[PDB]
Motif scaffolding. Structure first.
Motif, PDB file in Angstrom:
ATOM      1  N   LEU A 135     -10.319 -46.996   5.954  1.00 41.84           N
ATOM      2  CA  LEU A 135      -9.889 -45.876   5.124  1.00 41.84           C
ATOM      3  C   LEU A 135      -9.267 -44.768   5.965  1.00 41.84           C
ATOM      4  O   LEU A 135      -8.260 -44.170   5.569  1.00 41.84           O
ATOM      5  N   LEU A 162     -19.028 -42.001   1.403  1.00 47.33           N
ATOM      6  CA  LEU A 162     -19.558 -43.011   2.313  1.00 47.33           C
ATOM      7  C   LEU A 162     -20.377 -42.373   3.430  1.00 47.33           C
ATOM      8  O   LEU A 162     -21.367 -42.946   3.898  1.00 47.33           O
ATOM      9  N   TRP A 221     -24.666 -38.307  -3.810  1.00 47.04           N
ATOM     10  CA  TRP A 221     -23.655 -37.421  -4.385  1.00 47.04           C
ATOM     11  C   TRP A 221     -24.363 -36.237  -5.028  1.00 47.04           C
ATOM     12  O   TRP A 221     -24.612 -36.228  -6.240  1.00 47.04           O
ATOM     13  N   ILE A 243      -9.013 -42.207  -9.167  1.00 48.32           N
ATOM     14  CA  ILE A 243      -8.677 -43.292  -8.245  1.00 48.32           C
ATOM     15  C   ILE A 243      -8.148 -44.500  -9.010  1.00 48.32           C
ATOM     16  O   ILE A 243      -7.134 -45.102  -8.628  1.00 48.32           O
ATOM     17  N   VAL A 244      -8.823 -44.872 -10.100  1.00 43.39           N
ATOM     18  CA  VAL A 244      -8.383 -46.013 -10.898  1.00 43.39           C
ATOM     19  C   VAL A 244      -7.020 -45.737 -11.523  1.00 43.39           C
ATOM     20  O   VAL A 244      -6.153 -46.619 -11.568  1.00 43.39           O
ATOM     21  N   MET A 260      -4.385 -46.116  -8.757  1.00 43.27           N
ATOM     22  CA  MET A 260      -4.194 -47.512  -8.373  1.00 43.27           C
ATOM     23  C   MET A 260      -3.417 -48.277  -9.438  1.00 43.27           C
ATOM     24  O   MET A 260      -2.462 -49.002  -9.127  1.00 43.27           O
ATOM     25  N   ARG A 279      -9.462 -55.825 -17.070  1.00 49.71           N
ATOM     26  CA  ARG A 279      -8.909 -55.271 -15.839  1.00 49.71           C
ATOM     27  C   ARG A 279      -8.214 -56.354 -15.023  1.00 49.71           C
ATOM     28  O   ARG A 279      -7.093 -56.161 -14.541  1.00 49.71           O
ATOM     29  N   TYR A 323     -10.427 -57.617  -4.039  1.00 47.20           N
ATOM     30  CA  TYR A 323     -11.015 -56.647  -4.958  1.00 47.20           C
ATOM     31  C   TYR A 323     -11.362 -57.298  -6.292  1.00 47.20           C
ATOM     32  O   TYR A 323     -12.502 -57.208  -6.764  1.00 47.20           O
TER      33      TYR A 323
HETATM   34  C1  LIG Z   1     -11.348 -47.756  -7.082  1.00 51.74           C
HETATM   35  C2  LIG Z   1     -12.473 -47.053  -6.485  1.00 51.74           C
HETATM   36  C3  LIG Z   1     -12.553 -46.320  -5.270  1.00 51.74           C
HETATM   37  C4  LIG Z   1     -13.829 -45.802  -5.103  1.00 51.74           C
HETATM   38  C5  LIG Z   1     -14.276 -44.980  -3.939  1.00 51.74           C
HETATM   39  C6  LIG Z   1     -15.241 -43.847  -4.228  1.00 51.74           C
HETATM   40  C7  LIG Z   1     -16.308 -44.007  -5.075  1.00 51.74           C
HETATM   41  C8  LIG Z   1     -17.142 -42.966  -5.328  1.00 51.74           C
HETATM   42  C9  LIG Z   1     -16.899 -41.759  -4.706  1.00 51.74           C
HETATM   43 CL1  LIG Z   1     -17.995 -40.410  -5.056  1.00 51.74          CL
HETATM   44  C10 LIG Z   1     -15.822 -41.602  -3.827  1.00 51.74           C
HETATM   45  C11 LIG Z   1     -14.977 -42.662  -3.601  1.00 51.74           C
HETATM   46  C12 LIG Z   1     -14.466 -45.706  -2.593  1.00 51.74           C
HETATM   47  C13 LIG Z   1     -13.333 -45.996  -1.917  1.00 51.74           C
HETATM   48  C14 LIG Z   1     -13.432 -46.622  -0.679  1.00 51.74           C
HETATM   49  C15 LIG Z   1     -14.665 -46.927  -0.191  1.00 51.74           C
HETATM   50 CL2  LIG Z   1     -14.651 -47.719   1.390  1.00 51.74          CL
HETATM   51  C16 LIG Z   1     -15.835 -46.627  -0.880  1.00 51.74           C
HETATM   52  C17 LIG Z   1     -15.735 -46.003  -2.100  1.00 51.74           C
HETATM   53  S1  LIG Z   1     -14.755 -46.257  -6.442  1.00 51.74           S
HETATM   54  C18 LIG Z   1     -13.582 -47.117  -7.247  1.00 51.74           C
HETATM   55  C19 LIG Z   1     -13.609 -47.881  -8.570  1.00 51.74           C
HETATM   56  O1  LIG Z   1     -12.950 -47.574  -9.494  1.00 51.74           O
HETATM   57  N1  LIG Z   1     -14.548 -48.937  -8.719  1.00 51.74           N
HETATM   58  C20 LIG Z   1     -14.603 -49.627  -9.997  1.00 51.74           C
HETATM   59  C21 LIG Z   1     -14.378 -51.111  -9.758  1.00 51.74           C
HETATM   60  C22 LIG Z   1     -14.698 -51.433  -8.261  1.00 51.74           C
HETATM   61  C23 LIG Z   1     -15.758 -52.493  -8.200  1.00 51.74           C
HETATM   62  N2  LIG Z   1     -15.437 -53.453  -7.195  1.00 51.74           N
HETATM   63  C24 LIG Z   1     -14.218 -54.234  -7.193  1.00 51.74           C
HETATM   64  N3  LIG Z   1     -13.336 -54.107  -8.111  1.00 51.74           N
HETATM   65  N4  LIG Z   1     -14.046 -55.055  -6.269  1.00 51.74           N
HETATM   66  C25 LIG Z   1     -15.984 -49.407 -10.539  1.00 51.74           C
HETATM   67  O2  LIG Z   1     -16.633 -48.411 -10.159  1.00 51.74           O
HETATM   68  O3  LIG Z   1     -16.471 -50.203 -11.345  1.00 51.74           O
END
Ligand SMILES: Cc1cc(C(c2ccc(Cl)cc2)c2ccc(Cl)cc2)sc1C(=O)N[C@@H](CCCN=C(N)N)C(=O)O
Lengths: 269, 230, 224, 339, 59
Positions: free
Chosen positions: A12, A64, A70, A84-85, A88, A159, A212
Motif C-alpha cells: 500500500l 492497519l 477503529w 473505497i468501493v 474502485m 459484485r 480479490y
Molecule cells: C475495498 C476495501 C478497502 C478496504 C481498506 C480499509 C478498510 C477499513 C478501514 Cl477503517 C480502512 C481501510 C483496506 C485496504 C487495504 C488494506 Cl491492506 C486493508 C484494508 S476495505 C474494502 C472493502 O470494500 N471490502 C469489502 C469487500 C472486501 C472483502 N474481500 C475481498 N473482496 N477480497 C467488504 O468489506 O466486504
C-alpha cells in the motif's frame, strides 16, 4: 506482527508513493494543458478516481497500524469503505468504457466520427458514476461497528457479476476484436505493438482483480473459524492491496502511452 | 428596420391580452428587447426586458407576476401576455431594441407601439418641466440624480430620448458619446450626479419632450421630461 | 459590475457556445488535400468527386462529409504556406503514368515523371507531413498501356530490367514511388489504379479514409 | 544594347552603391550608444488569457483605442477581443477558412481579411442592421494575400503572393496603385506614421520602401540572407526593423540606407514570424519559432526580456498604440497579453 | 528576349534612380534615434513599470 500484514503495508505504501504524484501530474496536464477531447475526459475521470483512492489509502494504512481497532463512530465506518468501493467500481467501469470506446471506434468508425463527441462522453461518465454509487449502497447499509465490518452471499455474487466477470469478458472480447481487425484487413500492417499493449493491460487487470474476487467468493464457502478461513482473511489484506495497486497501474498504462501526452508532460516539467 | 406592434384596443378589467410585435430589417436574435409604457399626459416607464435566447429576463417591480414576455427567434416575433389588467394599465406600449457591446448604442430605434385602454432604486428627478425658448437662442436642460451613476469602469450610463408629437422617440445620446443619425449640435456634460444637455443650434425639428434614463441596474426609471414649445 | 457588463458577458457566452457548436459540426468532416505536378488528374478527380485562390467542395458519401482542397492555382513558394495544411487528414497525390515519356515544356532535358517523383519525395520528406496520410493515384491506365505497347519503359528508367508488361511496369513504378518514403513506420502510402468508374475510386477513397481514421484513433489512445 | 551589357551596368551600379555605403559608414549604433545606461532585466506577466479558438492563430492587429483587437485563425472566423473585460465583441464568419492576415481600420468601422484565397474581403462593423456583413470583395491578385493595412476609411494597401503590392480604393473597388518592383514573394508589410510611405519585405531577402502618392520605390535593402517574414516601422519614422528565417533581426534606416546592428544569439537558430517596437522604440519584440518571444534593446542589442508563455510557434504580435501592453498569438489557439 | 531585356532595362533604371538619392552620416541618425529614445523613455509603459493604480490590466 504478521508477515501478511507487513506485506500489505509495504504494498500500500509503494502504491501510494508511486500513484499520488504521477496521477496528480497527469490530471493537471490533462486538465490545464490538454485539449478537452473525449479521451481527455476519460483520462481526467480515471485520474480523479485514482487520486481519490490514493488519498483514501492513508486511512487504510492507519487502520492497519491500529491493527483492526477503529476508535471512531459508525459514521466513518460506513463512509470510508463505501468511498473505497465507489472509487474502485468507478475506475473499473471507466476502464470498461474506455475499452468499449476503443472497440467501437474500430467497429463503427464512421458512426464515431459523426456522433462521438464530448457530450456523450460526459453523459456516459455520469451514468457510470451513478451506477458505481448504486453499487456501494449495500456497503454503506450493512456495515456496522471495536471492529468495523459486516455481521451477504447475493451481495458478493452480484459484485462478482457486475465488477469482475462482465467487465473482464467485455475487455477481452474488445481487445481480441481489435487485434483481429488489425491483423485482418486490406491495408493491415505487420506489427505487434497493439497486441503486446493489449496483452499487458489484460494481464495487469487480471493479476490485480482476480485474487480479490477469488477470496471474496471463498469467504462464503469456508468457515472463518477454521485455519483455512483464518489464512483467507489474513491474505485478504494482500489481495485488496494488490487490487488497489491497479489504481497506480492504470495511469502509466493508459495516459502515459500517447506520444502527444508524453510530450506535453515532458514540457510541463 | 421596422417594428410593427398589434393587439391594442379596449380591454375589460380582469381580462387577458397578448400583444404581438413583428420585427424586420435586422437580426431579431441579436438584439435585446425592451418594453416602454407611456401614459397620457405623463412620462415613460420601463416594463420588461428580455435578452438573446431568453437567457436573461427581467420585469418591473410593479408588474411582477402579471406580465409574461416571450420571443420566437425562428419567426422573429415578440409576445407579451398581460393578465388581470387594472384601470391604470391604460397606456401606449413601445418595443425597443438594444445591443450591448463596446461602442454600441442601446435604445437606438423605437417602434410604433400600440395603445391599450382598460374600462428605493435609482429615480430620475428633473427640476424643470417646460422651458419656453425662441428661435435663435440656445437650450441647456439640467438634471439631478439621487445616486452617482459613475461606475468603477468610468462609463456614464445616461440615455437621452427626444419624443416628438406623433412620432417615435429618437435617441440623441447613449453614453457625451454622440449617437448616430443625429447632428453634432447636441452635447452632454456634467459630473456623475448632475448632468446637462446642451443644444448648439435650435432648429424647427428639435421640438418635443426630452427624457433622461439611467442604466446602472436592471430596474429602469425615466425622468419627468422637459417639453419645448415653439 | 453594471447591467451592460452582464449583457456583454452573456453575449460572450453565447458566442462561445456558437463557436463550440461550429467546431463540433466541422470536426466530423474529413479534409482531403490534392497534389500533383501540372494537370495530370486534377480535373478528372474533381469531376469524379463532384458526381482564383483555393477551391473547396463538400460532399457526403456513406454518411461521411469530405472537404476537398486544391492548391493547383497557387503559383508561389509552397514552403511558405504548406505549414497551413498540417492539420489535414488525407493528401491525394495524383500522377499520370503516361508522363514517363512526356517532358515539361520549360526544359526538354527533364521528364515529367522525374518531376513528379521529386515532388512526391519533397512532400513525403516534409517536416509538417510526418503523420499525414498520402494516397497515390495513377491516371490514364489505357494510355500508359498503349505507350508501353508502342515504346519501352527503359527510356526513362535506365536501371529498369524486365519485360514490357503493364502489370510488371505498374508494380515497378509503385515500388519506386513507395521507396521514396523514408518514414515507413509512421507514414503509409495507399496505391490505387484509377479508372473510368468513379464509384470504385470513391469507394477506395472512403475505405482509405476509414483506415486512416481508425489508425489515428488508435494512436491517440496510445494503443497503436 | 545587350543583356550582358545590362548585367555589367547593374553590377557596376551595385558596386558603386556598396562602396558609397561603406564610405558613408563613419560610425555604428553600437559604439555610439555604448555609454547610455543599460535597459536591465525585464519581466512580464500574463494579464489576459484569451481562449476560444479551435485552430492555429495567424494574425492579430490592434486598434486606435488600444482596447479592441482583431484575431484571425484557420477555423475561418474573425474574433474581436476586448482587452479589459476579456469579452468577445464580434464573431465574423469567413467564407474562406484559409485566412492568414487581418487588419483593423483606424476609425474602427471596417475590417479586412485575406489569405490563401486571392480575393480580399472587407467587412463592415458599424452596419445599421447590427450584424457584420460582407462590405465588399477585392479580386485581381494571382497569389495568396500575405498582409494588409488600412490607411484610411477609403484606401487600403496590401500584398499578395505574386511579386507585387496593390493599394485599392474602397469607393472604387479597383487597383488604385500597383508596385511591381519586388522580385520575390512579398510576405511583410508595414505602414509609416505619416501614412505617405510603407515598407515591404519579400522572400528574396529584400525590403523596399514605396510611396503612397508617388508610386515608385525609394530605397532597397539587402542586409538579410534569408526570406524576410516580418517588418515593422520605427515610431520615429526614420527606421524599420526586419526579421527573416536567419534568426537575426536587422534595423535599417531610411536616411542612412544601411544596417545599424544585427540582433542574433547563439542558441537562437529558428525563424522569425513577427517583430514590432514599443511606443518609445527602445524595445524590439520578436517572435521566434522556438516557442519563445524575445524583447531586445534597440540600442544595446542585448536580450532584455524572454516570454515563454506560449506552447506553440508565435505567429502574430502586436503592441498597443499607447504602449500599455503587447499581445501575442501562437498556433496553440491562445492569445496572451504581457506588459 | 524582348521581355527579359525590358525587365533588365527597368531594373537598371530603378537602381540608377535609387542611387541618385541623398545620404547622411550614420552617426547623426544614431544620435537622433538615441535622443528620441531618451525623450520617450518616460512615456513608455513597457520600458518603465507603471503602478497597479495606473495599470488597466492589473486585476
Ligand atoms: C475495498 C476495501 C478497502 C478496504 C481498506 C480499509 C478498510 C477499513 C478501514 Cl477503517 C480502512 C481501510 C483496506 C485496504 C487495504 C488494506 Cl491492506 C486493508 C484494508 S476495505 C474494502 C472493502 O470494500 N471490502 C469489502 C469487500 C472486501 C472483502 N474481500 C475481498 N473482496 N477480497 C467488504 O468489506 O466486504
Amino acid at each position: 506482527n504478521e508477515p501478511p500484514v507487513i506485506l500489505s503495508m509495504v504494498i500500500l505504501s509503494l502504491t501510494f508513493l508511486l500513484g499520488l504524484p504521477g496521477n496528480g501530474l497527469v490530471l493537471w496536464v490533462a486538465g490545464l494543458k490538454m485539449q478537452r477531447t473525449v479521451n481527455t475526459i476519460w483520462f481526467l475521470h480515471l485520474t480523479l478516481a485514482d487520486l481519490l483512492c490514493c488519498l483514501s489509502l492513508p486511512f487504510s494504512l492507519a487502520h492497519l497500524a491500529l491493527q483492526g481497532q477503529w476508535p471512531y463512530g459508525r459514521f466513518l465506518c460506513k463512509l470510508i469503505p463505501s468511498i473505497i468501493v465507489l472509487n474502485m467500481f468507478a475506475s473499473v467501469f471507466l476502464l470498461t468504457a474506455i475499452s468499449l470506446d476503443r472497440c467501437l471506434v474500430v467497429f463503427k468508425p464512421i458512426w464515431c466520427q459523426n456522433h462521438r463527441n464530448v457530450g456523450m462522453a460526459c453523459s456516459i461518465c455520469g451514468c457510470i458514476w451513478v451506477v458505481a454509487f448504486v453499487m456501494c449502497i449495500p456497503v454503506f447499509v450493512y456495515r456496522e461497528i471495536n471492529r468495523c465490518g459486516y455481521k451477504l452471499v447475493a451481495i458478493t455474487i452480484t459484485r462478482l457479476v457486475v465488477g469482475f466477470l462482465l467487465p473482464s469478458v467485455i475487455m477481452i472480447a474488445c481487445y481480441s476484436f481489435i487485434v483481429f481487425r488489425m491483423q485482418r484487413g486490406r491495408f493491415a500492417k505487420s506489427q505487434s505493438k497493439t497486441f503486446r499493449v493489449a496483452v499487458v493491460v489484460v494481464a495487469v487487470f487480471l493479476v490485480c482483480w482476480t485474487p480479490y474476487h477469488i477470496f471474496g467468493v471463498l469467504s462464503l464457502l469456508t468457515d472463518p473459524e477454521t485455519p483455512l478461513g483464518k489464512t483467507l482473511m489474513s491474505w485478504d489484506h494482500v489481495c485488496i492491496a494488490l487490487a488497489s495497486a491497479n489504481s497506480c497501474f492504470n495511469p502509466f498504462l493508459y495516459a502515459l502511452l500517447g506520444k502527444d501526452f508524453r510530450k506535453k508532460a515532458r514540457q510541463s516539467i | 428596420v421596422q417594428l410593427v406592434e398589434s393587439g391594442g384596443g379596449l380591454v375589460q378589467p380582469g381580462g387577458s391580452r397578448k400583444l404581438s410585435c413583428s420585427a424586420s430589417g435586422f437580426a431579431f436574435s441579436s438584439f435585446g428587447m425592451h418594453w416602454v409604457r407611456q401614459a397620457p399626459e405623463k412620462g415613460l416607464e420601463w416594463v420588461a426586458y428580455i435578452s438573446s435566447g431568453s437567457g436573461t429576463i427581467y420585469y418591473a417591480d410593479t408588474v411582477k407576476g402579471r406580465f409574461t414576455i416571450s420571443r420566437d427567434d425562428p419567426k422573429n416575433t415578440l409576445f407579451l401576455q398581460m393578465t388581470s389588467l387594472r384601470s391604470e394599465d391604460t397606456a401606449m406600449y413601445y418595443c425597443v431594441r438594444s445591443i450591448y457591446y463596446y461602442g454600441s448604442s442601446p435604445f437606438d430605434f423605437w417602434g410604433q407601439g400600440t395603445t391599450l385602454t382598460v374600462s428605493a432604486d435609482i429615480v430620475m428627478t428633473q427640476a424643470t418641466s417646460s422651458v419656453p425658448v425662441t428661435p435663435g437662442e440656445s437650450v441647456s436642460i439640467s438634471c439631478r440624480s439621487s445616486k452617482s451613476l459613475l461606475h468603477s469602469n468610468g462609463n456614464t450610463y445616461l440615455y437621452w430620448f427626444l419624443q416628438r408629437p406623433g412620432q417615435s422617440p429618437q435617441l440623441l445620446i447613449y453614453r457625451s458619446n454622440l449617437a448616430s443619425g443625429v447632428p453634432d449640435r447636441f452635447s452632454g456634460s456634467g459630473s456623475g450626479t448632475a448632468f446637462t444637455l446642451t443644444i448648439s443650434r435650435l432648429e424647427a425639428e428639435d421640438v418635443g419632450v426630452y427624457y433622461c434614463m439611467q442604466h446602472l441596474e436592471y430596474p429602469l426609471t425615466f425622468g419627468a421630461g422637459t417639453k419645448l414649445e415653439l | 459590475l453594471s447591467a451592460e457588463d452582464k449583457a456583454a458577458v452573456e453575449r460572450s457566452k453565447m458566442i462561445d457556445r456558437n463557436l463550440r457548436e461550429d467546431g463540433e459540426k466541422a470536426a466530423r468532416e474529413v479534409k482531403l488535400l490534392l497534389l500533383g505536378a501540372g494537370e495530370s488528374g486534377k480535373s478528372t478527380i474533381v469531376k469524379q468527386m463532384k458526381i482564383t485562390g483555393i477551391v473547396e467542395t463538400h460532399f457526403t458519401f456513406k454518411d461521411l462529409h469530405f472537404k476537398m482542397f486544391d492548391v493547383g492555382a497557387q503559383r508561389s513558394e509552397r514552403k511558405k504556406w504548406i505549414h497551413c495544411f498540417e492539420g489535414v487528414t488525407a493528401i491525394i497525390f495524383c500522377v499520370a503514368l503516361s508522363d514517363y515519356d512526356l517532358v515539361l515544356a520549360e526544359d526538354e532535358e527533364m521528364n515529367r515523371m522525374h518531376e513528379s517523383m521529386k515532388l512526391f519525395d519533397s512532400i513525403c520528406n516534409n517536416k509538417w507531413f510526418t503523420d499525414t496520410s498520402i494516397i497515390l493515384f495513377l491516371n490514364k491506365k489505357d494510355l500508359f498501356e498503349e505507350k508501353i505497347k508502342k515504346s519501352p519503359l527503359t527510356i526513362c528508367y535506365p536501371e529498369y530490367a524486365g519485360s514490357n508488361t503493364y502489370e510488371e511496369a505498374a508494380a515497378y513504378i509503385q515500388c519506386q514511388f513507395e521507396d521514396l518514403n523514408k518514414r515507413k513506420d509512421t507514414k503509409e502510402i495507399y496505391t490505387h489504379f484509377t479508372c473510368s468508374t468513379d464509384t470504385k475510386n470513391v469507394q477506395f477513397v472512403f475505405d482509405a479514409v476509414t483506415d486512416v481514421i481508425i489508425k489515428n484513433n488508435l494512436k491517440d489512445c496510445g494503443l497503436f | 544594347s545587350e543583356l550582358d551589357q545590362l548585367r555589367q551596368e547593374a553590377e557596376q551600379l551595385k558596386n558603386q552603391i556598396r562602396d558609397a555605403r561603406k564610405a558613408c559608414a563613419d560610425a555604428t549604433l553600437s559604439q555610439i550608444t555604448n555609454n547610455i545606461d543599460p535597459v536591465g532585466r525585464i519581466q512580464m506577466r500574463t494579464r489576459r488569457t484569451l481562449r476560444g479558438h479551435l485552430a492555429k492563430i495567424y494574425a492579430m492587429h490592434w486598434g486606435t483605442d488600444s482596447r479592441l483587437l482583431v484575431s484571425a485563425s484557420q477555423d475561418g472566423k474573425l474574433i474581436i477581443w476586448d482587452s479589459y473585460t476579456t469579452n468577445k465583441v464580434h464573431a465574423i464568419p469567413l467564407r474562406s477558412s484559409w485566412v492568414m492576415t487581418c487588419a483593423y481600420a483606424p476609425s474602427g468601422n471596417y475590417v479586412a481579411c485575406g489569405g490563401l484565397d486571392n480575393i480580399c474581403s472587407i467587412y463592415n462593423l458599424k452596419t445599421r442592421e447590427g450584424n457584420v456583413r460582407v462590405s465588399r470583395e477585392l479580386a485581381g491578385h494571382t497569389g495568396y494575400l500575405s498582409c494588409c493595412r488600412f490607411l484610411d476609411d477609403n484606401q487600403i494597401v496590401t500584398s499578395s503572393g505574386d511579386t507585387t503590392c496593390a493599394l485599392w480604393d474602397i469607393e472604387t473597388g479597383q487597383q488604385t496603385t500597383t508596385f511591381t518592383g519586388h522580385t520575390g514573394d512579398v510576405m511583410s508589410l508595414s505602414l509609416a506614421p505619416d501614412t505617405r510611405l510603407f515598407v515591404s519585405g519579400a522572400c528574396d531577402a529584400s525590403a523596399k520602401l514605396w510611396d503612397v502618392r508617388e508610386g515608385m520605390c525609394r530605397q532597397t535593402f539587402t542586409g538579410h540572407e534569408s526570406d524576410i517574414n516580418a517588418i515593422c516601422f520605427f515610431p520615429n519614422g526614420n527606421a524599420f526593423a526586419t526579421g527573416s528565417d536567419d534568426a537575426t533581426c536587422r534595423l535599417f534606416d531610411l536616411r542612412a540606407d544601411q544596417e545599424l546592428m544585427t540582433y542574433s544569439h547563439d542558441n537562437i537558430i529558428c525563424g522569425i514570424t513577427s517583430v514590432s517596437f514599443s511606443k518609445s522604440g527602445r524595445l524590439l519584440l520578436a517572435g521566434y519559432d522556438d516557442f519563445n518571444c524575445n524583447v531586445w534593446d534597440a540600442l544595446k542589442a542585448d536580450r532584455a526580456g524572454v516570454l515563454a508563455g506560449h506552447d506553440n510557434r508565435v505567429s502574430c504580435l502586436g503592441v498597443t498604440d499607447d504602449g500599455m501592453a503587447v499581445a501575442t498569438g501562437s498556433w496553440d489557439s491562445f492569445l496572451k497579453i504581457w506588459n | 528576349n524582348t521581355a527579359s531585356i525590358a525587365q533588365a532595362r527597368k531594373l537598371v533604371e530603378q537602381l540608377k534612380m535609387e542611387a541618385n538619392i541623398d545620404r547622411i552620416k550614420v552617426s547623426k541618425a544614431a544620435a537622433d534615434l538615441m535622443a528620441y529614445c531618451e525623450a520617450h523613455a518616460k512615456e513608455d509603459p513597457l520600458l518603465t513599470p507603471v503602478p497597479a493604480s495606473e495599470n488597466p490590466f492589473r486585476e
